Design an enzyme around this catalytic site. Structure first.
Site, PDB file in Angstrom:
ATOM      1  N   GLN A   1       0.850  -1.231   0.000  1.00  0.00           N
ATOM      2  CA  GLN A   1       0.000   0.000   0.000  1.00  0.00           C
ATOM      3  C   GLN A   1       0.871   1.261   0.000  1.00  0.00           C
ATOM      4  O   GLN A   1       1.913   1.308   0.658  1.00  0.00           O
ATOM      5  CB  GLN A   1      -0.952  -0.006   1.207  1.00  0.00           C
ATOM      6  CG  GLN A   1      -1.946   1.149   1.254  1.00  0.00           C
ATOM      7  CD  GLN A   1      -2.970   1.096   0.131  1.00  0.00           C
ATOM      8  OE1 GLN A   1      -3.608   0.066  -0.097  1.00  0.00           O
ATOM      9  NE2 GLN A   1      -3.139   2.213  -0.574  1.00  0.00           N
ATOM     10  N   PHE A   2       0.431   2.275  -0.740  1.00  0.00           N
ATOM     11  CA  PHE A   2       1.183   3.520  -0.890  1.00  0.00           C
ATOM     12  C   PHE A   2       0.940   4.464   0.288  1.00  0.00           C
ATOM     13  O   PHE A   2      -0.205   4.750   0.644  1.00  0.00           O
ATOM     14  CB  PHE A   2       0.816   4.220  -2.204  1.00  0.00           C
ATOM     15  CG  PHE A   2       1.385   5.607  -2.332  1.00  0.00           C
ATOM     16  CD1 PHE A   2       2.758   5.810  -2.360  1.00  0.00           C
ATOM     17  CD2 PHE A   2       0.547   6.712  -2.423  1.00  0.00           C
ATOM     18  CE1 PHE A   2       3.285   7.086  -2.478  1.00  0.00           C
ATOM     19  CE2 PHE A   2       1.069   7.991  -2.544  1.00  0.00           C
ATOM     20  CZ  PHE A   2       2.440   8.178  -2.573  1.00  0.00           C
TER      21      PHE A   2
ATOM     22  N   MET B   1      -2.919  10.321  -4.677  1.00  0.00           N
ATOM     23  CA  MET B   1      -2.730   8.925  -4.269  1.00  0.00           C
ATOM     24  C   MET B   1      -2.465   7.996  -5.459  1.00  0.00           C
ATOM     25  O   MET B   1      -2.865   6.829  -5.458  1.00  0.00           O
ATOM     26  CB  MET B   1      -3.932   8.441  -3.446  1.00  0.00           C
ATOM     27  CG  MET B   1      -4.108   9.191  -2.138  1.00  0.00           C
ATOM     28  SD  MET B   1      -2.713   8.924  -1.028  1.00  0.00           S
ATOM     29  CE  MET B   1      -3.088   7.270  -0.443  1.00  0.00           C
TER      30      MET B   1
ATOM     31  N   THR C   1      -2.748   4.232  -6.140  1.00  0.00           N
ATOM     32  CA  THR C   1      -1.814   3.285  -5.463  1.00  0.00           C
ATOM     33  C   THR C   1      -1.506   2.097  -6.367  1.00  0.00           C
ATOM     34  O   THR C   1      -2.412   1.469  -6.913  1.00  0.00           O
ATOM     35  CB  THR C   1      -2.400   2.760  -4.134  1.00  0.00           C
ATOM     36  OG1 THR C   1      -2.536   3.847  -3.204  1.00  0.00           O
ATOM     37  CG2 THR C   1      -1.503   1.670  -3.526  1.00  0.00           C
ATOM     38  N   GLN C   2      -0.220   1.800  -6.528  1.00  0.00           N
ATOM     39  CA  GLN C   2       0.210   0.618  -7.266  1.00  0.00           C
ATOM     40  C   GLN C   2       1.449   0.026  -6.607  1.00  0.00           C
ATOM     41  O   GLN C   2       1.844   0.425  -5.508  1.00  0.00           O
ATOM     42  CB  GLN C   2       0.523   0.933  -8.743  1.00  0.00           C
ATOM     43  CG  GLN C   2       0.030   2.268  -9.281  1.00  0.00           C
ATOM     44  CD  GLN C   2       0.995   3.401  -8.974  1.00  0.00           C
ATOM     45  OE1 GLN C   2       1.464   3.540  -7.844  1.00  0.00           O
ATOM     46  NE2 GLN C   2       1.302   4.211  -9.982  1.00  0.00           N
TER      47      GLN C   2
END
Ligand SMILES: [Mg+2]
Ligand SMILES: [Mg+2]
Ligand SMILES: [Mg+2]
Ligand SMILES: [Mg+2]
Lengths: 195, 204, 196, 125, 222, 226, 212, 233, 195, 196
Positions: free
Chosen positions: E1-2, H107, H1-2
């Site tokens: 997760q970022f 994000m 997000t990746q």
């Protein structure tokens, strides 16, 4: 269980404990006595997880009664409180710890002084002029900090205790069904039957 | 939830010219609730002084444990335990509970009775020794104490000057910590006299 | 999957196994993984069959519309259209595509587009779960400017090994040859390639 | 552990170690018990071969097992302490589980049971 | 997760004098256990005799300072080159911060200058925009090491006059600019000794009626 | 923490920084990380500081008893085997990461040790948070057949790289040289490149500054006669 | 944090502590927890500092616009409802507030509204909010009368915060007092808790548990 | 997000008396698989700037296309596109830094760490860093990923502070960079032997060196190493 | 909030609602009125999540008052209850649903009949002789099942209600600080000021 | 890791790379993964270095005690002791070991013990993370009864490819030859095997 209070005055220690027992949804009883006499001049009130409270209290009672018979001598309140603290300090690192908090009120016949000890389930002991467990102190300590004097009579102590219970009955969400009050002095332990 | 900050409290120790000082606050609490203002955290076994911060049940337990052990030491050795030796005993005792530790921050202070040399030492909860020449700190306001000591401290302070330095270090550190305060005690220790002073401080 | 494309003297050849999988059950043992997006621009598909079929259908549409306006697209252009779809929708796609094509100006070209949506122009490319087992073999045996027969043998031998070790790969080996001469389909059955 | 059978039968059907234990009782100072209509009295002999004794602190011959039951004895003084301790523990255990103090018959039955056990257990006299 | 946030360390300190104000900060920038830069300026002259620092996550910090500098520029355009007073700058920064209440700038902001009576002024902000005028404020990594020292040496807390024994407090006499800089240098020297993220260099920006001056001092590089 | 070990002509040298930390706070500025297992077998520890010191002293104690039992000077391979088997048993829960070096009747030796029990052999090694900074210096300047003076120089340079570049490391350089046929020389604070500058101000207070409630003499003496 | 407000004969007393904490670290001892919405309205700060500051100075702007448009002082009822309706729009998003909106108008008299970030809006006589609220309630409940003098009411509010500051670890620093009249609020100073505690202990005879 | 798929490792750089140097290897990894062996990760912009990129390769190829488009766009209606109004290193960096911070704020980051190296109009050396979080900083030496931990310590021994820059020649600087690349090949499991190096000088301009190899490697000492402790054979 | 009760007798509807408001630890108020008059002969009591309760009640009140002015006519209790049900049925599939349960007591002036409707936050409507929300029904329904008659007077209804509140005060753990009682009949809505 | 063992006409040869890894950092670039448990019974280690060193030490102890009582153990016996430790402690171990040895009666033998603790006797075996990339190459190039020089070349070429593609593998190629003639150690440096 819920509310347990203690106050040490000039010549006695007064313990007040709630009467309610609640099984989740319903109040099963409204006359429960949350205390055990450990010796003629030492009283212990208790609160914590169901079952463990009475099991611990009666276990302590049995041990102090055994000491009294063996030595034909009553242990000082300080000595009893130290024994209790060690049992709880041992318990906290056990497989399943006793989830029990206690107040020990005793009159030391040698020093002719009342004594109040507060001990939580971890084994944290402090001697105090007045004490409590749970949320009870949050409501009552500001009143005790103001009015308390070391030279108070037993009657003045009961009056200050009534003011504390009135504040609890006003601001606490739970109905604890009043309190049973007991006095510990040079003559032993007695219950105030009208409170 | 974190055992080392349920009850709160602090200890600090310093060295001076032919003397040492150790000091602590007096608070015991249940998180936000202040419970006691008379909970002293400095104990002594002969001429060796031990301060303990952290979980209060363990503070009491360890004091009782080291009283136990130093009493047996004295009976067998026929002499009082020295600061250097006691430091090793604290370390040994803590490490034996490596995987179920006492949640504490002990601090040793004293003067060796034979060499006259001032001595201080600190430990983590599992026994690692920190033997500093200057000062040792412990408790929930240890960051604040590190900041005070680092600027206020200078070497070879006379006993009465060292008192002022350590007192100001404790007081101002405690006032920046919610879980420390409610009174304070300072021990000034010389080779054959120890003076104990209770400090006047804010009670919030 | 075991898929590969190899440039050679006369152009480029694409190769693939025929096994489609849902778990350990072979949902199709005779699958065609070599897919036509233009007359002499084909691709090899690996990953989600839904995703790679959707992408290939969109690319075929894009190149059909390109051809109507600007004439025959380059292999580089076809690879770019694949990349644009794979990069911009990287969060929602599981696709690993090898693009192979024959121009007359540029001759045989191979582009590989892995999971992230990056593009890499290569002399030859391998992909799919079965490709891991033949990195060593292919690197040792690939030469530039091979003949048609040599390239067919290189792919046949390579995919034979990939099938032998990868449970997800199997069935027949399909091949598509892209040269100036036209488009030739080849098929090789188990009894042939297993004894190699 | 030490397992030796010290109490065993003899050809005439006697267990001598038990009978010799009675001889130790014969040597002990005299003890007497008398029950009236509303009381019981326990009397005990003190041998006056020992003066310069401190009577304040010297172990007394009658011992309270609980607040309502007492125990006196004749025989080995050290042995009696072990029976008294066990009886005192059992008395508190009975109060803890039954929520009633022991009857005099129950306490007697327990002490007698301990004594019997030490006549057919290995490694003990 | 970022994870959109990071921590670039750093420590900053603002003190308001009688007719001056200082805003100081170390020049070290870090991630985890690595040093990114030994000299990366963190305190900025924003025009109109206002200095600013936004300590914490450096990307958010740079973004905020950049947007405030921009706000000063547009204040001049929109309101006939009127000087932006320190109190007006503070309220404006609150709105910049609260604008991202539900995705905050992960920084602790401090500004310094003079108020409209010429007296020294320092303002302090939390990440979502709550603010207060203050006499003394440290921010960032070693804030907990510095503030107790300042309570004692600037405000003379817990200090009483000899002979009276607690009855008479030590009087709060005003400090010169030379005296304040001495305390700032000692604060950062002490913080450098005990905090791993503090070191390399110390840059101080001093604000008086005459303008903004800079002073630089070496700190330990370990 | 930065610790290194370097082999040379007639022995081995180990070195370490002197900073110990609790999170971002420096607990001790002049920590001793070079431990003695036996007179001529020394080790340096990274990781959990109590563990590196406890495991060193346990094995050091058992090594001393072994040396007395066998009437032989202790061997490095013995210390290594005893350390790894102890650490494997505790499955890495004892967080001790060690570089073990020494001389014995067999020769000079250099090993390192991971907390889970794995060992390795080398001519140059580094461990701790500053190991990458140190290893960069070692990989740049190490050669075969180093002299004693060259190895001390290389080892301390590798620690300096950790001191200046790793936030987990700092303060001073400690060195220990173990040469064949000689006493091991422990060089405490071999380099001191981080002395604090004089402060701008003295913070000595006037006497009587602190408010006092009560004074009393503490009885540290035993119960007195007469 | 400890904040209180109560209605009485002479208007409203508002009393607050001054401490702000981040975990165990005391960030500030000089926090202004009474927001001066305008010369006639006060709001208290509990929960989120920013949420309370931002939205209550915003409230001051809405009140100013109301009296410009309607040529009449806004009621405490209307002022409190503007704030409660606003935070109700944000419900679920994570706002944190617990505040008392205090005012004294002709039509209403002295009025206090407790306003909460989950949308609650309660009119009442005595409110107490914060980590030390239970301690302050004790002193309030046992000493409160409608017929208190301004001098005695000001002391009761000061004393109730002191009670909380003493026991609650997260309350302290100093006490800020305000008296709200029909003609506006009047500030009654900043009182350091350190100095106040000893002064009250000696003069009152309370806190016998503490050595001084 | 990746998550990053195909990735590139360290980029390293430093300043010297007359300009800047930057370097990066030619590998594109697919996890532990060393999949693509001919990937150029230094991308020149004009004759005064070189942008070095690590991290996700698909995002690198996107950034490469943005920079290509930036040059095209700057030339539009610009008679001084090859003179006074050419792209500066500082312009190129600020643009990238803006994009990186915007993308993290939605994000949806570009999963990269970037170093922009160049020389300004007035001859001043430019060297600044930016990453997926939008974090930026400058220093006499800069490095990404593993380079940060291993290259910086070595490069900082040559230029430790600002005053060391005029005392550092291009020969000494290049030597230091090449050595650092060797060290990274010894110690980074996601590195390759093949790399590219670029020098931007205020006098001699942009020198771009391809197909460089790590040489003068020490491996001979391995023959004497046996077992893991007690083994002799 | 907590306890809300309703009973429909011969000629009126009686609603009883608790007075306590609790913010977690403390009881902030002991005189809260958990009801809104929707029209002269229709009353709605409510309980659920803080804020949403009053916001929903006042929103409904505003809408019914708007209808009354527009048509110069009072909607029947049945019509009002249907409007309320639809609003809650709409709300349950919203981004953030109203967590509110209501009782609607009304006197239908056309049919000359009292009517009591129980609606939960999902939009579940039932017409009942007596009803409750939360745990209130668990304690009171056995008493109502026994004593209730359709031909009861208002005074008999209040007496049966007192018996219900007494049982609640005995067996419930929470102190709800008594109830405010309101009667809805042909003459409108009035509050019983001594209960 | 990249490890392998190959039987040939005169016996058996073990091969390995020298790279040890904690993440992407090479914690040791000159590791010795070829381990002696008896004079002519060696093993190749892969997995946790702690686990495989602990196991190998215990096996060496077991075979030293076996030798003192019953004489030289067979390679099958050594494999069985490895298996017993790996199978019975499967829950707590991460170890993949190849056992290779030379008897005079049985000549060269190779046993592979994967994660589960199963045993498989094979003509040759490959293991470690790098082995995946050379399944194809090794299957195509292995012959039974090769010469010493041919087997050295087979292993050198195989591990060269494994190192080329696997980031976890690298450094020098170590080899140990087991024949009637004795025990020979070989080492091959990067400049040699990279140009193959
Ligand atoms: Mg404090
Ligand atoms: Mg407080
Ligand atoms: Mg530092
Ligand atoms: Mg490799």
């Amino acid at each position: 269980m819920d509310i347990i209070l203690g106050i040490r005055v000039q010549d006695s220690v007064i313990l007040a404990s709630s009467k309610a027992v609640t099984r989740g949804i319903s109040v099963l009883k409204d006359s429960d006595d949350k205390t055990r006499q450990l010796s003629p001049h030492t009283l212990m009130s208790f609160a914590g997880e169901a079952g463990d409270t009475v099991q611990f209290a009666e276990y302590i009672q049995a041990n102090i009664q055994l000491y009294s018979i063996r030595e034909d001598y009553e242990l000082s309140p300080q000595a009893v409180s130290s024994f209790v603290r060690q049992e709880l300090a041992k318990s906290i690192r056990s497989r399943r710890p006793y989830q029990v908090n206690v107040l020990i009120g005793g009159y030391d016949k040698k020093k002719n002084k009342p004594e109040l000890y507060q001990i939580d389930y971890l084994g944290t002991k402090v001697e105090l002029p007045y004490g409590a467990h749970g949320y009870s102190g949050f409501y009552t300590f500001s009143l005790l900090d103001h009015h308390y004097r070391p030279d108070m009579t037993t009657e003045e102590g009961l009056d200050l205790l009534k003011l504390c219970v009135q504040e609890l009955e006003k601001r606490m969400p739970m109905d604890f069904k009043g309190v049973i009050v007991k006095i510990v002095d040079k003559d032993g332990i007695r219950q105030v039957d009208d409170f | 939830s974190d055992p080392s900050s349920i009850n709160g409290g602090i200890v600090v120790a310093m060295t001076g010219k032919d003397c040492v000082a150790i000091a602590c606050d007096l608070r015991l609490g249940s998180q936000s609730l202040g419970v006691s203002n008379k909970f002293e955290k400095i104990f002594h076994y002969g001429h060796v002084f031990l301060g303990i911060t952290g979980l209060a049940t363990d503070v009491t337990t360890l004091n009782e444990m080291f009283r136990y052990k130093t009493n047996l030491y004295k009976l067998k050795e026929e002499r009082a335990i020295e600061p250097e030796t006691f430091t090793q005993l604290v370390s040994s005792s803590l490490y034996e509970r490596r995987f179920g530790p006492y949640f504490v921050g002990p601090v040793v202070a004293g003067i060796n009775s034979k060499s006259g040399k001032p001595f201080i030492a600190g430990f983590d909860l599992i026994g690692c020794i920190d033997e500093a020449k200057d000062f040792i700190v412990s408790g929930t306001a240890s960051d604040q104490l590190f900041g005070m000591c680092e600027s206020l401290y200078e070497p070879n302070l006379e006993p009465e000057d060292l008192f002022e330095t350590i007192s100001q270090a404790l007081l101002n550190a405690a006032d920046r910590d919610a879980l420390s305060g409610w009174g304070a005690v300072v021990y000034i220790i010389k080779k054959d006299e120890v003076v104990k002073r209770y400090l006047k401080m804010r009670q919030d | 999957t075991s898929i590969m494309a190899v440039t050679f003297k006369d152009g480029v050849i694409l190769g693939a196994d025929s096994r489609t999988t849902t778990g350990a059950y072979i949902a199709n043992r005779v699958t065609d993984k070599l897919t036509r997006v233009h007359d002499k621009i084909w691709c090899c598909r690996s990953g989600s069959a839904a995703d790679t079929q959707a992408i290939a259908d969109i690319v075929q549409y894009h190149l059909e519309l390109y051809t109507s306006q600007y004439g025959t697209p380059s292999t580089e252009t076809a690879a770019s259209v694949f990349k644009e779809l794979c990069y911009e929708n990287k969060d929602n796609l599981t696709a690993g595509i090898i693009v192979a094509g024959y121009d007359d100006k540029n001759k045989g070209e191979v582009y590989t587009i892995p999971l992230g949506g990056s593009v890499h122009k290569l002399p030859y490319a391998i992909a799919g779960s079965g490709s891991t087992f033949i990195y060593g073999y292919c690197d040792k045996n690939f030469r530039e400017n091979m003949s048609k027969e040599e390239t067919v043998d290189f792919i046949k031998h390579s995919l034979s090994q990939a099938i032998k070790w990868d449970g997800s790969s199997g069935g027949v080996i399909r091949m598509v040859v892209l040269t100036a001469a036209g488009v030739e389909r080849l098929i090789f059955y188990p009894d042939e390639y297993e004894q190699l | 552990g030490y397992d030796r059978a010290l109490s065993i039968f003899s050809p005439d059907g006697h267990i001598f170690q038990v009978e010799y234990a009675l001889e130790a009782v014969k040597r002990g100072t005299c003890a007497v018990g008398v029950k009236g209509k509303n009381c019981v009295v326990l009397g005990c002999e003190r041998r006056s071969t020992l003066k310069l004794q401190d009577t304040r602190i010297t172990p007394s011959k009658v011992s309270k097992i609980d607040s309502h039951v007492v125990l006196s004895f004749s025989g080995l003084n050290a042995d009696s302490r072990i029976l008294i301790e066990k009886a005192r523990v059992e008395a508190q255990s009975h109060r803890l589980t039954l929520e009633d103090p022991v009857t005099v018959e129950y306490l007697t039955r327990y002490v007698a049971g301990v004594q019997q056990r030490y006549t057919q257990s290995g490694g003990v006299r | 997760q970022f994870n959109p946030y990071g921590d670039n360390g750093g420590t900053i300190l603002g003190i308001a004098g009688e007719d001056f104000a200082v805003l100081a900060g170390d020049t070290r920038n870090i991630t985890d256990y690595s040093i990114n830069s030994r000299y990366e300026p963190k305190v900025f002259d924003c025009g109109d005799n206002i200095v600013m620092s936004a300590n914490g996550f450096a990307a958010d910090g740079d973004a905020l300072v950049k947007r405030f500098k921009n706000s000063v520029k547009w204040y001049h355009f929109d309101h006939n080159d009127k000087k932006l007073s320190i109190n007006s700058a503070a309220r404006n920064i609150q709105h910049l911060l609260y604008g991202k209440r539900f995705f905050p700038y992960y920084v602790h902001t401090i500004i310094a200058g003079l108020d409209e009576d010429g007296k020294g002024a320092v303002y302090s902000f939390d990440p979502v925009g709550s603010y207060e005028r203050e006499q003394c404020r440290a921010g960032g990594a070693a804030a907990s090491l510095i503030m107790p020292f300042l309570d004692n040496q600037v405000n003379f807390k817990n200090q009483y006059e000899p002979g009276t024994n607690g009855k008479v407090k030590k009087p709060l006499k005003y400090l010169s600019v030379e005296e304040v800089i001495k305390l700032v240098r000692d604060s950062f020297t002490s913080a450098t000794e005990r905090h791993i993220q503090v070191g390399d260099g110390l840059e101080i920006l001093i604000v008086t009626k005459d303008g903004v001056r800079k002073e630089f001092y070496e700190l330990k590089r370990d | 923490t930065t610790i290194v070990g370097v082999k040379f002509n007639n022995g081995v040298v180990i070195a370490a920084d002197t900073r110990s930390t609790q999170g971002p706070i420096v607990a001790d500025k002049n920590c001793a990380k070079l431990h003695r297992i036996s007179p001529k077998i020394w080790c340096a520890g990274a990781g959990t500081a109590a563990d590196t010191e406890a495991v060193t002293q346990l094995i050091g104690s058992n090594i001393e008893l072994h040396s007395l039992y066998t009437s032989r000077e202790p061997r490095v391979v013995s210390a290594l085997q005893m350390l790894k088997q102890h650490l494997f048993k505790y499955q890495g829960h004892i967080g001790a990461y060690l570089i073990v070096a020494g001389v014995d009747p067999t020769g000079s030796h250099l090993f390192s040790i991971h907390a889970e029990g794995s060992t390795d052999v080398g001519y140059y090694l580094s461990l701790g948070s500053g190991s990458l900074a140190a290893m960069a210096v070692l990989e740049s300047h190490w050669k075969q057949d180093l002299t004693k003076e060259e190895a001390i120089k290389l080892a301390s340079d590798a620690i300096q790289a950790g001191i200046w570049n790793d936030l987990g490391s700092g303060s001073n350089v400690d060195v220990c040289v173990m040469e064949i046929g000689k006493d091991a020389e422990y060089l405490r604070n071999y380099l001191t490149p981080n002395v604090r500058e004089e402060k701008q101000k003295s913070y000595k207070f006037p006497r009587g500054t602190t408010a006092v409630l009560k004074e009393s003499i503490v009885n540290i003496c035993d119960i007195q006669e007469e | 944090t400890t904040t209180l407000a109560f209605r009485f004969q002479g208007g409203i007393i508002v009393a607050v502590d001054s401490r702000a904490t981040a975990g165990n670290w005391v960030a500030s001892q000089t926090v202004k927890k009474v927001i001066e919405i305008n010369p006639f309205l006060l709001g208290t700060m509990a929960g989120g500092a920013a949420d309370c500051q931002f939205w209550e100075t915003w409230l001051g702007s809405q009140c100013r616009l109301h009296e410009l448009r309607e040529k009449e002082r806004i009621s405490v009822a209307a002022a409190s409802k503007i704030l409660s309706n606003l935070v109700y729009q944000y419900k679920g998003a994570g706002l944190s507030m617990g505040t008392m909106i205090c005012g004294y108008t002709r039509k209403e008299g002295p009025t206090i509204y407790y306003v909460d970030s989950d949308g609650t809006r309660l009119k009442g006589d005595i409110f107490c909010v914060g980590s030390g609220q239970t301690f302050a309630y004790g002193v309030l409940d046992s000493n409160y009368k409608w017929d208190l003098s301004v001098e005695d009411a000001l002391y009761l509010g000061k004393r109730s915060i002191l009670a909380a500051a003493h026991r609650d670890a997260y309350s302290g620093g100093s006490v800020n007092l305000y008296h709200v009249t029909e003609d506006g609020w009047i500030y009654h100073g900043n009182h350091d808790v350190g100095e106040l505690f000893w002064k009250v202990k000696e003069e009152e005879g309370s806190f016998n548990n503490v050595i001084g | 997000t990746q998550q990053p798929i195909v990735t590139g490792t360290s980029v390293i750089s430093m300043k010297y008396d007359n300009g800047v140097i930057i370097a990066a290897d030619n590998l594109g990894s697919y996890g532990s698989l060393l999949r693509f062996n001919g990937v150029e990760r230094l991308i020149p912009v004009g004759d005064n700037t070189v942008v070095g990129i690590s991290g996700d390769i698909s995002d690198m190829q996107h950034i490469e296309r943005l920079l290509k488009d930036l040059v095209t766009e700057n030339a539009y209606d610009n008679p001084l596109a090859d003179a006074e109004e050419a792209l500066e290193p500082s312009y190129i960096f600020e643009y990238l830094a803006t994009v990186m911070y915007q993308r993290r704020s939605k994000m949806n980051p570009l999963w990269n760490a970037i170093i922009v190296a160049g020389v300004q109009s007035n001859g001043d050396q430019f060297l600044r860093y930016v990453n997926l979080l939008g974090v930026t900083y400058s220093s006499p030496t800069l490095a990404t990923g593993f380079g940060a931990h291993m290259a910086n310590p070595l490069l900082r021994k040559v230029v430790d502070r600002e005053s060391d820059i005029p005392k550092t020649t291009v020969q000494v600087a290049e030597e230091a960079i090449v050595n650092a690349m060797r060290v990274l090949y010894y110690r980074d499991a996601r590195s390759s032997r093949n790399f590219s190096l670029a020098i931007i000088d205020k006098n001699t301009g942009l020198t771009f060196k391809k197909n460089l190899q790590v040489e003068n490697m020490k491996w001979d000492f391995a023959k004497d190493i046996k077992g893991y402790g007690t083994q002799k054979i």
